[PDB]
Structure 1
Amino acid sequence: DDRELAILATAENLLEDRPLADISVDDLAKGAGISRPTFYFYFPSKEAVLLTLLDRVVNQADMALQTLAENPADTDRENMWRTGINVFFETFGSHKAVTRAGQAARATSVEVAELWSTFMQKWIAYTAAVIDAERDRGAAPRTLPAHELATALNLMNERTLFASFAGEQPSVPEARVLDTLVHIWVTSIYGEN
């Protein structure tokens, strides 16, 4: 793993300064202190380096969210939603270059597309299960289908977080995004007709 780790670290650091396209395999071996052929032993391509970096970021989010799901943080419903959204805000916000490049890679790469899609389905299914419980306990009204509600709320968070982290025009300022998303989640989940 040692040289592997070094290639990974080098790729994340270089991705802070430029896109994958403008980083070469020699760039990565160089930064990792190895030759170009030795690189090809650890990874088949620079594309595969990103995949692995993205894979680690996405699992770290997912594991963090599972940790919460095993610990009912003794609190109000607004705060429960906030705490879970914040897992994503912090995890991806700590790995902006990889998030940024991983999103872009979805266009060009079926493995990146499928990884992102697999995790989104999981996070949506968990969101829906929580909405259902809130409904069964009688705290949330039976409005939209829980899964379709979960789907749009997760897609909002996806787009809105990434816009904010990349500083897009338009975007919600990074210091306002969490409140903005929590409001919309809580009002749409608990709000009646």
Structure 2
Amino acid sequence: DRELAILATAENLLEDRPLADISVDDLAKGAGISRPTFYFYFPSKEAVLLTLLDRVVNQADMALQTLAENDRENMWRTGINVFFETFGSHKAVTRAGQAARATSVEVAELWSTFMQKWIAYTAAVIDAERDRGAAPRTLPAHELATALNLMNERTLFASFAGEQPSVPEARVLDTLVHIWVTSIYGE
């Protein structure tokens, strides 16, 4: 309500500048509320970012669950694309959220909890592919899954932030899908 206005303001301001350069007064002003009214909904601007990141992570997780409840190259591409579109639609929050992992235990723990879930699901799909005889028994599935998820984390976030170096955003899906399919199916 006022909560949503605060969150919408924070997402808008993060498009232009870092959390460090955004005051509680900036978020209050943008949301049309006082400073003490702000503090009724959120203990800090840090908790605003935690809630924004929580919503974006849950949106991606819910989109991947929808896919899971329904060719091998297209199967992986469709799944990687959940993360590309979801985080790529929320670049300001992605970026600020990754930077807050260093300073926020709640942000580090949110990101860690979802990465463990996404890795466990990746490993379960590789195992299914091995069980049906489509993928060879090479590396431990859980270790392969970990490295691939870490690759995607670093490569997606570098591309969205326009880091040097980065894969251009228009090439990153093809790039990741190639490495996933060759490393999962390759003998």
Note whether the superposition's TM-score is higher than 0.5: yes
- Match of 1:107, SS state, is coil
Q: What displacement does 1:143 show?
A: 0.1
CA deviations on 1:111-158 (whole Å, 9 max, x unpaired) are: 000000000000000000000000000000000000000000000000
Distance 1:139 1:82 in 2: 17
CA deviations on 1:150-184 (whole Å, 9 max, x unpaired) are: 00000000000000000000000000000000000
Q: What displacement does 1:107 show?
A: 0.3
Q: What displacement does 1:96 show?
A: 0.3
Residues 1:134 and 2:129 are matched in the alignment? yes
CA deviations on 1:12-58 (whole Å, 9 max, x unpaired) are: 00000000000000000000000000000000000000000000000
Distance 2:112 2:30 in 1: 31
Other-structure match for 1:34: 33
CA RMSD of aligned residues (A): 0.2
Identity in percent: 100
Q: What displacement does 1:8 show?
A: 0.2
Other-structure match for 1:79: 74
Gaps of 5+ in 2: none
Distance 2:5 2:91 in 1: 19
Other-structure match for 1:15: 14
Gaps of 5+ in 1: none
Distance 1:109 1:44 in 2: 14
Other-structure match for 1:70: 69
Q: What displacement does 1:104 show?
A: 0.1
Q: What displacement does 1:70 show?
A: 0.3
Q: What displacement does 1:98 show?
A: 0.2
Distance 2:104 2:50 in 1: 9
Q: What displacement does 1:62 show?
A: 0.1
Distance 2:147 2:12 in 1: 33
Q: What displacement does 1:187 show?
A: 0.1
Distance 2:79 2:12 in 1: 28
CA deviations on 1:45-103 (whole Å, 9 max, x unpaired) are: 000000000000000000000000001xxxx0000000000000000000000000000
Other-structure match for 1:98: 93
Distance 1:65 1:131 in 2: 16
Other-structure match for 2:46: 47
Distance 1:123 1:106 in 2: 18
